[PDB]
Amino acid sequence: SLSTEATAKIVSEFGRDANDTGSTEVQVALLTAQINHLQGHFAEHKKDHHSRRGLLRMVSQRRKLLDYLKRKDVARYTQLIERLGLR
Amino acid sequence: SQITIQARLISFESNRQQLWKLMADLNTPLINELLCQLGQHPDFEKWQQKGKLPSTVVSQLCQPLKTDPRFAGQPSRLYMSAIHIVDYIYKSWLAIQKRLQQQLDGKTRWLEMLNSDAELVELSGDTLEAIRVKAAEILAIAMSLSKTLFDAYQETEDIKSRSAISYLLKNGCKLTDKEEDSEKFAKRRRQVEIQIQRLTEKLISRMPKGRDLTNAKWLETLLTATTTVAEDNAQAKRWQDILLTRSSSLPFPLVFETNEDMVWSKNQKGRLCVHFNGLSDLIFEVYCGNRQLHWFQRFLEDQQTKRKSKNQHSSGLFTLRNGHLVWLEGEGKGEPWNLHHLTLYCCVDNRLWTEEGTEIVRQEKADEITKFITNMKSDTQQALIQRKQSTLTRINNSFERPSQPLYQGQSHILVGVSLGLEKPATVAVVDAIANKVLAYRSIKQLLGDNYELLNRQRRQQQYLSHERHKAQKNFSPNQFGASELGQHIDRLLAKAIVALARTYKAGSIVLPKLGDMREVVQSEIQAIAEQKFPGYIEGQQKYAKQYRVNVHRWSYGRLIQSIQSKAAQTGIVIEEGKQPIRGSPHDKAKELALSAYNLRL
RNA sequence: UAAUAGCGCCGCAAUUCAUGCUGCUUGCAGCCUCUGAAUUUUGUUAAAUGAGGGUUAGUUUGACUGCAGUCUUGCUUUCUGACCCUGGUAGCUGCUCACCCUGAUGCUGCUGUCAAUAGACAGGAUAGGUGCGCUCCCAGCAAUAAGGGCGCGGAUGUACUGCUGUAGUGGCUACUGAAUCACCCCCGAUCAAGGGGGAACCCGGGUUGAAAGGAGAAGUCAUUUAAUAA
């Protein structure tokens, strides 16, 4: 999981205001940071079957938050996808 | 009659690495030739209807793949190994599917036919006695009885009077006076409905999957799933089912179906050596215990005897039949050809060891080849016949071999073996003309000094099943079971039963027609559980877990095979019969042997 | 302190016969000295089973020829012995927790010493409960079965381990500590390789624990762990 400094850095950059501890844009940015660091380890230690459980949860949570934001506000959804480099 | 023996093969890296590269490259057309039939082939449903693969189709898919830029680097015998394996994969899978289709139809007839006594009265518009009288007429006509009654129901509808034929069939081809409980009938008719449902859920089976060593689909899916967003729950789960899949680490084995495509020799150091057709640069050294060495010396003696005799003796009687070359998985770190272990598994027909046994195979093949030639009676067909006629003349020229008189047993003395859940075996030796039991054995006698091993097997199954549960909750790789102990116990009983059959000069060993006990129990316990937890499906599954699990762990097919193998190596005939539903384990064994004796005519 | 009960095994006490023991009537009479089946009972320095994790190309189960002489290979497994350990730091990573109640196929349970903090040090497979074990039972913990209660911010169009967080417990990779044995001791080789020196006993030769083998490929179902979904 992320360092303390790394979370604080990510919430301050995706949060719309000093009040955002966990808007849908902050929650997807923290799952995205985790997934990138986890793909770099799980492709190397292919035998680590306890980390595949962690990845498949963490990707599935991101997709639900994105589908919710798509219907709620397509402009916020489009800007979030750009800023996270997703397709 | 056949057995498999084995040795590890040793050879310097360059040879164990070159062979690995050919098998990692061969393993791939073993997958592309399944896909060329899995989805590509248009006729596939005609094969599923017939239950058999056409004898040339895999070769006709492989021949143009021999020049493929991906597959072209391999010897002519490695392509025949590919064609062999893919032929056997589908020739098995289609034959599994056909018997399931036949069972589903063969019970769909019965679910339509199985009626309550009140339904027979309504459907006939007549009395249940009129039905008993017509059932008595049908038995009088009939006198394969069960088959004849199913034929007489298919044909001959006879103004719905075939309802009386269904009355015979549900009563086990016999007349019955009693009128049945509709609750017992409801359980009975429900078991048939459950078996129909489960057969369809099984018949919808997966296609054969090849050993993809590349991880390419898995790596592509990983980078897809982590960098992109799925458009559907079905797509997000499709990536999960791929990412959870464990990939294979070993290529398919080479199969050498011609015994002469292995060449044997003796090394300067006195050790035995082998080489394969198309790999004749790569000499390998045999390493095996002296408990098995006598076959590997016999391989070389069979070969030298033919070569010393200007090919006038045939490998139609060579002790080696076919070889399967396989990489057994090693442990720790290293390149695959330094980590794994080349092992050569030789199929051997054990009755070729002796001269008296070789003469059986000479007569068996000489009769089969004579018939084949007379059935053929083409261009290359003319050369196939010359090869068969030349085998038929050469097979008469004998190898110098060990002599041992054949076993002979008394045609009236039989060993009955009774299998069950609590007693894996129990034995009665019957003189069938005296109607006299010569001896009985229970398990405590039937493996003597080893009787502690049954208690060990039950402790080990229970202990290890709990440890596997605890280990899975922690994602530990430690996953172990009593399978090799159960295999040893089934072999101890197989030796003791045949030693007992030899002791009393028995003419045969009798084994029960157990059939598919696992599926039968699974439907009986479900039809019952549905009456005790209606609507609560989780409670229905929990109803008798330990009984259903003990039936799925019951090794009856492996004990039946272990006895068959050891009996046929000794020369004792195997016979079969219905095992009684009631009586003690001894009475079951007694009546089983007497039933198999009564079935002689 | 506690663990009374339930369930599975292990013998021990009997009772009933036989697949056994004496006869000739080759099928009866007779009993339980053995060897075995069935039921019941029992937990008496009775007897018998008895899963903390690991270690040897180990020994014996082998082939051929008339029980004697030749040849012998180190494969895949099951036991019995014996010995060793109860681990070390260097990264990567999963899960779990605002705080409470219920407490799960949940974790933990040995001897001695110092602390009496939660942990070190030295011993060790006798290691909570019984003759021996359990998903059962007792004791402590319980966030990491599950359900319910419920505080304050963000979000609030159905998403919300998403906040209250530095520890707990795992997984994996690299290096490393001990045993690398089959009567002990010593020097080595692990796709190979053996050699040297002793103790004890039997009648200068042996002995110094035994067993099993049909394998590959594909498909399926049984519970049981994880993820996902309505």
Numbering used by the authors:
A (entry chain S): 2 to 88
B (entry chain O): 2 to 144, 173 to 406, 412 to 635
Question: What text comes from the article?
Answer:
CRISPR-associated transposons (CAST) are programmable mobile genetic elements that insert large DNA cargos using an RNA-guided mechanism. CAST elements contain multiple conserved proteins: a CRISPR effector (Cas12k or Cascade), a AAA+ regulator (TnsC), a transposase (TnsA–TnsB) and a target-site-associated factor (TniQ). These components are thought to cooperatively integrate DNA via formation of a multisubunit transposition integration complex (transpososome). Here we reconstituted the approximately 1 MDa type V-K CAST transpososome from Scytonema hofmannii (ShCAST) and determined its structure using single-particle cryo-electon microscopy.
